[PDB]
Design an enzyme around this catalytic site. Structure first.
Site, short mmCIF file in Angstrom:
data_model
loop_
_atom_site.label_atom_id
_atom_site.label_comp_id
_atom_site.label_asym_id
_atom_site.label_seq_id
_atom_site.Cartn_x
_atom_site.Cartn_y
_atom_site.Cartn_z
N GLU A 154 -79.48 15.57 37.29
CA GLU A 154 -79.42 15.23 36.02
C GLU A 154 -80.53 14.28 35.62
O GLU A 154 -81.01 14.26 34.16
CB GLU A 154 -78.16 14.66 35.51
CG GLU A 154 -76.91 15.52 35.81
CD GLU A 154 -76.76 16.53 34.90
OE1 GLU A 154 -77.53 16.54 33.92
OE2 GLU A 154 -76.07 17.42 35.18
N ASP A 189 -79.90 17.86 25.95
CA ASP A 189 -80.07 18.56 27.13
C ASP A 189 -80.49 19.81 27.10
O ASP A 189 -81.35 20.28 26.30
CB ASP A 189 -78.69 18.53 27.76
CG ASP A 189 -77.49 19.41 27.30
OD1 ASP A 189 -78.07 20.15 26.28
OD2 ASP A 189 -76.45 19.64 27.53
N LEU A 215 -72.71 14.04 28.41
CA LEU A 215 -72.83 14.86 27.12
C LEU A 215 -72.15 13.86 25.95
O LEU A 215 -71.04 13.54 26.16
CB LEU A 215 -72.13 16.21 27.18
CG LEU A 215 -72.03 16.94 25.61
CD1 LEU A 215 -73.19 17.36 25.23
CD2 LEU A 215 -70.86 17.81 25.70
N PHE A 247 -69.36 19.21 36.82
CA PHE A 247 -69.88 18.08 36.14
C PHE A 247 -70.75 18.93 34.77
O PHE A 247 -70.67 18.56 33.77
CB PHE A 247 -70.47 17.52 37.14
CG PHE A 247 -71.21 16.08 36.26
CD1 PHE A 247 -72.56 16.20 35.66
CD2 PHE A 247 -70.40 14.88 36.40
CE1 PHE A 247 -73.12 15.06 35.17
CE2 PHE A 247 -71.06 13.59 35.91
CZ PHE A 247 -72.40 13.81 35.26
N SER A 294 -66.30 34.53 42.51
CA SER A 294 -67.12 33.74 43.30
C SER A 294 -65.91 32.81 44.00
O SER A 294 -66.20 32.46 45.31
CB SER A 294 -67.97 32.86 42.65
OG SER A 294 -69.08 33.81 41.99
N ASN A 296 -73.10 36.64 44.15
CA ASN A 296 -72.19 36.63 43.30
C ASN A 296 -72.39 35.32 42.23
O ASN A 296 -72.56 35.34 40.97
CB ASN A 296 -70.83 36.68 43.48
CG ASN A 296 -69.82 36.99 42.32
OD1 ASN A 296 -69.17 36.11 41.59
ND2 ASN A 296 -69.81 38.21 42.08
#
Ligand SMILES: [Cl-]
Ligand SMILES: [Cl-]
Length: 164
Positions: A11, A20, A32, A104, A117, A132
């Site tokens: 990040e 972002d 966020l 996250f 998955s 996948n």
């Protein structure tokens, strides 16, 4: 290497409000603020989060505090999620970190939607799960970061993050 260092690599750290990859107002280490198109709305959410009139700028200490809260929240969401929890419990320490990373970034809801998955991971079918996971908007929009997480799930080591 650990979850904190892992996410700090993915990040980055910015002390002023920024947009972002999806164009949403964010700050710090991927925190966020709002999906709203208004800077004001973002500034207001920031103040509420920090507890002071910030003027769109925070200190490093403030960023780290939001980060700590956000990781904690990510772990707590996994444990409370009926679809996520069983997966997380089945995994080793390194792969757990990759699942936290995904939560996250996209939220519990988003991750919980990777049904197939998830089942492959729980089954320990690493290569299959990796194929996948790549068939997703997530991989197509942020391929480098997705590759890092996917490699992690595939190998169970931190190799994708070593050097970074
Ligand atoms: Cl908050
Ligand atoms: Cl990327």
């Amino acid at each position: 290497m650990n979850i904190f260092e892992m996410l700090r690599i993915d990040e980055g750290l910015r002390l002023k409000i920024y947009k972002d990859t999806e164009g949403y107002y964010t700050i710090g280490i991927g925190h966020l603020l709002t999906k709203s198109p208004s800077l004001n709305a973002a500034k207001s959410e920031l103040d509420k989060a920090i507890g002071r009139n910030t003027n769109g700028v925070i200190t490093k200490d403030e960023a780290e505090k939001l980060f700590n809260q956000d990781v904690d929240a990510a772990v707590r969401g996994i444990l409370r999620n009926a679809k996520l929890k069983p997966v997380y419990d089945s995994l080793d320490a390194v792969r757990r970190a990759a699942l936290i990373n995904m939560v996250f970034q996209m939220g519990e809801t988003g991750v919980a939607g990777f049904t197939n998955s998830l089942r492959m991971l729980q089954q320990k079918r690493w290569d299959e799960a990796a194929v996948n996971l790549a068939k997703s908007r997530w991989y197509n929009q942020t391929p480098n970061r997705a590759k890092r997480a996917i490699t992690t799930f595939r190998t169970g080591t931190w190799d994708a993050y070593k050097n970074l």
